[PDB]
Design an enzyme around this catalytic site. Structure first.
Site, PDB file in Angstrom:
ATOM      1  N   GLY A  19       0.806  -1.209   0.000  1.00  0.00           N
ATOM      2  CA  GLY A  19       0.000   0.000   0.000  1.00  0.00           C
ATOM      3  C   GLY A  19       0.836   1.253   0.000  1.00  0.00           C
ATOM      4  O   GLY A  19       2.058   1.199   0.166  1.00  0.00           O
ATOM      5  N   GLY A  62       0.298   5.979   0.536  1.00  0.00           N
ATOM      6  CA  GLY A  62      -0.467   7.129   1.000  1.00  0.00           C
ATOM      7  C   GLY A  62       0.455   8.330   1.019  1.00  0.00           C
ATOM      8  O   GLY A  62       1.576   8.269   0.501  1.00  0.00           O
ATOM      9  N   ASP A  75       0.582   3.183  15.324  1.00  0.00           N
ATOM     10  CA  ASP A  75       0.185   4.595  15.340  1.00  0.00           C
ATOM     11  C   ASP A  75      -0.613   5.002  14.086  1.00  0.00           C
ATOM     12  O   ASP A  75      -1.374   5.970  14.111  1.00  0.00           O
ATOM     13  CB  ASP A  75       1.425   5.477  15.467  1.00  0.00           C
TER      14      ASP A  75
END
Ligand SMILES: CCc1nc(-c2cccc(C)c2)c(-c2ccnc(NC(=O)c3ccccc3)c2)s1
EC number: 2.7.11.24
Length: 338
Positions: free
Chosen positions: A28, A30, A165
């Protein structure tokens, strides 16, 4: 001493990693960067490798990079995500532009092990124990997680759990009411509130406080835990904040035994201690580990605390190259765990 690096393009980014990390596979991305699964031929371990994006683009980015790296290097606990490796393809500070972080590859979070089902009481004990063991360590470093939720809890097939986190490659449902309201003095037990919400949901198979919005969230919380009693109101500094409390309808605290029907009475007692509205009266992580509910897992001699964590950098305003240099120092000084 420097390993041989190799280049590889993915997804549309040139990854340069030491040869030990093989079969890179994007999991992934981001705004933070990109994560690949890799096979670590040094250890035989499946690892996640994260390439940070724009680590030194601005003062803020650079300080964030340094923050993230410093924290990860300090977090050395079985129930907290830590660092297997940190590297850069740079051979000098002047060359230094990329930061890669390495950790154990995690395949699942708490949501996808649970699948919104009732877990057994024994299973809840084990999961909540681990969270609290991780939290004891986190809180002992004078850190507050502030964002505990199922998606921040990684869980392998053996239900071994680590606190994250940032999740894997709403939030308001697990947030303490003092954060929901704008009470500008919270303590570490905001994380304990979150743990209680998670625990309740694991036991019941239903979200404890699934608010539709900010207001609904508080409404749902207060229906269970009651409106602030006289002791709590005495600690609220702002007139308008007290006016807000009094304006809203006054309800008693519910008896959690009449809420968590059929639950282990010790589970109910612990939830009562976690979900106290007054955060000054909320159970700490360490006290919670000693609670009878955890008798089958509690070991006072294997619930370690962290070294003192120097967070003084937080108050500093430095230039980009200073943050970059400080980060570089932390890359080169990294000693792998044994
Ligand atoms: C969203 C920001 C993230 N950062 C990391 C990460 C990676 C390497 C090192 C560090 C410190 C964090 C992530 C990470 C760490 C470990 N495992 C994963 N695994 C996965 O995201 C994953 C998801 C589905 C299938 C298989 C794997 C991600 S996610």
């Amino acid at each position: 001493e420097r390993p041989t690096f190799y280049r590889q393009e993915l997804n549309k980014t040139i990854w340069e990693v030491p040869e030990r990390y093989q079969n890179l596979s994007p999991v992934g991305s981001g705004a933070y960067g990109s994560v690949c699964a890799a096979f670590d031929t040094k250890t035989g371990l499946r690892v996640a490798v994260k390439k940070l994006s724009r680590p030194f683009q601005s003062i803020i980015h650079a300080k964030r990079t340094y923050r993230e790296l410093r924290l990860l290097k300090h977090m050395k606990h079985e129930n907290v995500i830590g660092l297997l490796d940190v590297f850069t393809p740079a051979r000098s500070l002047e060359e230094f532009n990329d930061v890669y972080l390495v950790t154990h590859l995690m395949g699942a979070d708490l949501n996808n092990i649970v699948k919104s089902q009732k877990l057994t009481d024994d299973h809840v004990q084990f999961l909540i124990y681990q969270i609290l063991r991780g939290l004891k360590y986190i809180h002992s470093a004078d850190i507050i997680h502030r964002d505990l939720k199922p998606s921040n809890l990684a869980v392998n097939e053996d239900s071994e759990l680590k606190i994250l986190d940032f999740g894997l490659a709403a939030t308001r449902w697990y947030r303490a009411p003092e954060i929901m309201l704008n009470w500008m003095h919270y303590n570490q037990t905001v994380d304990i509130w979150s743990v209680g919400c998670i625990m309740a949901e694991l036991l019941t198979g239903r979200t404890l406080f699934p608010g539709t919005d900010h207001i609904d969230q508080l409404k749902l919380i207060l229906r269970l835990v009651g409106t602030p009693g006289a002791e709590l109101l005495k600690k609220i500094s702002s007139e308008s904040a007290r006016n807000y409390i009094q304006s809203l309808t006054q309800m008693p605290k519910m008896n959690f035994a009449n809420v968590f029907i059929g639950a282990n009475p010790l589970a109910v007692d612990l939830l009562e201690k976690m979900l106290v509205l007054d955060s000054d009266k909320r159970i700490t992580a360490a006290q919670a580990l000693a609670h009878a509910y955890f008798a089958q897992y509690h070991d006072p001699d294997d619930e370690p605390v962290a070294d003192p964590y120097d967070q003084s950098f937080e108050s500093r305003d430095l230039l980009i190259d200073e943050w970059k240099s400080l980060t570089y120092d932390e890359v080169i000084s990294f000693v792998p765990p044994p």
